[PDB]
Amino acid sequence: ESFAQLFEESLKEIETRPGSIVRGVVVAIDKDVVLVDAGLKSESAIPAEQFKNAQGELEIQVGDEVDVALDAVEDGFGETLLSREKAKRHEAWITLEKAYEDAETVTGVINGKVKGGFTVELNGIRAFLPGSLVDVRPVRDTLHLEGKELEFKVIKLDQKRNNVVVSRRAVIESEDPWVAIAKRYPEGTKLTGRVTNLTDYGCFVEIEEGVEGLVHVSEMDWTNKNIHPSKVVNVGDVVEVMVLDIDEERRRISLGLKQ
């Protein structure tokens, strides 16, 4: 009756769009596809590579629950955008928690400055940093034991572009993209960027606040023409890329990957 109408609004009330409500129960595993059901129109064709943790083997059997992501519906049949992105929100919450007490305390091990700043990795993911943040002072972890264990103390974050730089050592110590597009510019600032779609001439890695990069086809590897990008890297993966070139005018930042 209005039973059903009340239920419809109830079920509205007890779900949300993003990957927030850990609801999808893993109802079939086979390699290389995991599948869930989060109260959506269809079941998600999940990769296995969203769900192996830090050493390469699976961690969740049948019945286990992780939320995925939404706001994109039915490319022709199916439902979702993947769940690790959901994990990105949890990582963002942990990073924000710092604000409360002005200190987020984890493990942070930064061996080398990709784009000027040491790369700091939190449990599964690894993020890239600006130079100063790796070290509180000129200490320079190159003389520290390789991949050492301290923490991360935040020096700098870009706040729209997920670039976060953190201070590994020294426990005692405690429109918009295109006007000032000179930050990752100079010649060779490398970046950690997720690829989006490979257009058979390109890969379209683009992460840094609403920009677009192309590592198109020529570099990508150390073979030129017989390469077919889909074979050689991935879909949806954070990689080594750097700028190599910027247009601020015709908005074509032409990244590379042969580096």
Partner: protein, 70 residues
């Protein structure tokens, strides 16, 4: 496409940068289009036909993609 060789920059790299700049400008294409005169009708026809081709490529092939080849 004005360019200046940076200090301790290789020549070949500089040439490559220049070529890229030219490509961006579309100078060669510009020249090609202005070699002789195109009738307005012809210009219109080309533009329209190109758009039609683009639309075909966007939609019909997508539809085809839905179905598997083998």
């Amino acid at each position: 496409p004005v360019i200046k060789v940076r200090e301790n920059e290789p020549f070949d790299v500089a040439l490559r940068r220049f070529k890229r700049s030219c490509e961006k400008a579309g100078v060669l294409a510009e020249v090609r289009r202005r070699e002789f005169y195109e009738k307005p009708t012809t210009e219109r026809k080309r533009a329209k036909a190109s758009a039609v081709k683009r639309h075909a490529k966007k939609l019909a092939r997508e539809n085809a993609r839905r179905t598997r080849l083998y």
